[PDB]
Amino acid sequence: EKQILCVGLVVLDVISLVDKYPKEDSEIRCLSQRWQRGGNASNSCTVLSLLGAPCAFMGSMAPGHVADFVLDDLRRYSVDLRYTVFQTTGSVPIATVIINEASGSRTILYYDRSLPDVSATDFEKVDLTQFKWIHIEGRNASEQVKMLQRIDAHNTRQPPEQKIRVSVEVEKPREELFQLFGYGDVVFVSKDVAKHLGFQSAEEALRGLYGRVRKGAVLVCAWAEEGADALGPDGKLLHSDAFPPPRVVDTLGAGDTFNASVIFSLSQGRSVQEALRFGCQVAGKKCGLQGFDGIV
Amino acid sequence: EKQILCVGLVVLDVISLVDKYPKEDSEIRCLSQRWQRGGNASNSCTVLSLLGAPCAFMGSMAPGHVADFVLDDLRRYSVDLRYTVFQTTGSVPIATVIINEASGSRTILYYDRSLPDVSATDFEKVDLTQFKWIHIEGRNASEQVKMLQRIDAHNTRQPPEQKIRVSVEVEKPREELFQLFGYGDVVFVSKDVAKHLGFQSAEEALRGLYGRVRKGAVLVCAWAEEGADALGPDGKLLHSDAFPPPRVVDTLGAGDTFNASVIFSLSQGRSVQEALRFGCQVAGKKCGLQGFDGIV
C-alpha cells in the first residue's frame, strides 16, 4: 500500500497535569509532568499509524536529545522518516501544556525556537509516486502553496485512480494561511479560525467559506462538543454529533485525532458522512484516555 | 565579616512570559521563556549578596546540567557553596512559572523530583563559628527542628554578642511546618499560611500566632499590596505600607527579596520598624524589574 504523507512540525509537549486550572498568582502542586511528542501533523501520523495506515512524516529537525526523544517516538510508530529535514540552526519548539485533570482541558503556551520551516525546495525532493494522500499542516503558506502546486502538476499527468489526494489544515487565525483554502480535496478549518472570522457555528463557517475552496473540494469544520460538519460540491451540509467519553481526561491532540481519522476513513473510500462520524468517534474515545495509544 | 547562612532548596524556574493570563483551554504565544535560578532561601542569598552581605547557601544538589546552571549562577553572586549536599538520587526540582506581563503576577506550577532534603546529620557538619545569622526555609521540619536545636545549644555557650541570630520561614500551609514557629529570633509567616489558618490581615495573623513564638521573638507577616507587619515581645504592632514601583513587571521572588532585606537590615543592627520599611522598599523596587540584579 502507498503511504500517507504528513508535512508539518514536530513539537515537544511538556505536560503538567493539575487537579484544577491554576488560579492566577497562585502556587499549585502538579499531579505529574511528562514529555509527549506533539505537533499537529505529527500527532495525526501517530493516529494514522495506530489505525493501520502506513505513513511518512516530513518536518524540520534539529539534532540533540529532544530530537532523539521525538524521532525515537515516531520510529516506535513505524512512521517513515526518510524526508526529515535536518537544520543546522534553531531547535525543536517546546509547548508547555497544562492539563486540568477535572475537565481534560488543555491550555498551551507555545514558544517558537526559530527552527527553519520545510521549504518548497525541500519538498521538490519527495518522490510523489510513493504516496496516495498528502496532508499539509498550514504554516509557511507561500512555500506550501508551491508544494501544493507541485502535487497538482503531478496529478494532471496521472489517471483518475492514481491521483494523489490532498488535504490541508488551517488551524491558526493567521492571514497568510487563508490562501491555502483554495488547495486540496479536503480542507480542515478550525473553530478558532471560524470564530476569528466572525462565525458562530460550524455551519455558518462552512456556508461562509465554501466559496474559497477549489472546485470539488470538501470543507470540514470540527466544533468540539457540538460535533463536526462538512460541506461538499453538492451543497449538502453534513454533520456528526460528538461522541464524548464517560469522563473526559485529556483533550490534547483531539483535533489531530479527528483530522487523521477523517483522512483515514476517506482514504479507505468511505463517504464524507461516515468519515465525519468515524472522526468524531475516535476523537471522543481519545478524549477519555491519556495520550493516543488506547484508541485501538 | 561572618557570613549569613541560608538553608533551603535551589529550584530551576522555567519562566514563560505572556501578555495576558492564559484563558483555560486556549493556546497563547509566549513573549519569551527563560531559565532562572529560584527557590526561597536561594533567592534570599541572591538578594543578600546584592545588598553586600557575605553569605553561604546550604541545599541538596544532583549533578547534571541543571545543577551546573544553578551552581554557576550562585558562584556569580559569590555565594559560598561549601555546604552543598550532593545527592546520588533524585534531581533539582523544576517550577514552571507563568508571568503575566500585564500585571507582573506569577503563577507557579511546582513538580517535586524526589531529591532528598538536607538532614540534621548533614547540618551537624556546619562550622557554626563561621556565621552571624542562620536562615532556615521551612521544609522537612522534624529534621530542621534538630538543626535549630544544635544552633541553640551552640548559643548557650557563647557571649550575648557572639550568639548566632536565627530566622525561619513558614511559607507553605503544611501542618508539619507549624512547629517551626517556636524557634528563631525572627519568624516569617506567609500570607498564604495566615489565610489558610483563617486570618484576614497581617495584624490578625500576628495577634493570633504570637503565642507560638519563643520568648523574645519577632513575628513578621508580609501581605503583598498591603505592606508588611511585625510583632515583638513589647506587644507593639509595627507596620510598613508597600512601596510599589510605577509599573509592576515581575513579582517572582518578591517575598524572598522582602525576607532577605529584613534579615540584612536587622543584622546591621536596625530597628524592626526600619527593617520592615527597608524590606518593603527593596521588594517593591524588585517588582518593577525582571529578576533581581537592578535592585542595586
Ligand SMILES: Nc1ncnc2c1ncn2[C@@H]1O[C@H](COP(=O)(O)OP(=O)(O)NP(=O)(O)O)[C@@H](O)[C@H]1O
Ligand atoms: N470535549 C469533547 N467531548 C467530546 N468530543 C470532543 C470534545 N472535544 C473535542 N471533541 C471531538 O474532537 C473533534 C475535534 O476537536 P477540536 O475542536 O478540533 O479540538 P482541538 O483544540 O483542535 N484539539 P488539539 O489537537 O489539542 O488542538 C470535535 O469535533 C469532537 O468530535
Ligand SMILES: Nc1ncnc2c1ncn2[C@@H]1O[C@H](COP(=O)(O)OP(=O)(O)NP(=O)(O)O)[C@@H](O)[C@H]1O
Ligand atoms: N504587587 C506589589 N506591589 C508592591 N509591593 C509588593 C507587591 N507584591 C509584593 N510586594 C512587596 O513584597 C513583600 C512580600 O510579598 P509577598 O506577599 O511575600 O509575595 P510572595 O508570593 O511570597 N513572592 P514569591 O517569593 O515569588 O513567593 C510585600 O510585603 C510587599 O512589601
Ligand SMILES: OC[C@H]1O[C@](O)(CO)[C@@H](O)[C@@H]1O
Ligand atoms: O502546534 C503546537 C501544538 O498543537 C498540538 O499539535 C495540538 O494540536 C500540540 O500537540 C502541539 O504542541
Ligand SMILES: OC[C@H]1O[C@](O)(CO)[C@@H](O)[C@@H]1O
Ligand atoms: O519553592 C518553589 C518556588 O518559590 C520561589 O522560591 C518564590 O519564592 C520560586 O523561586 C521557586 O521556584
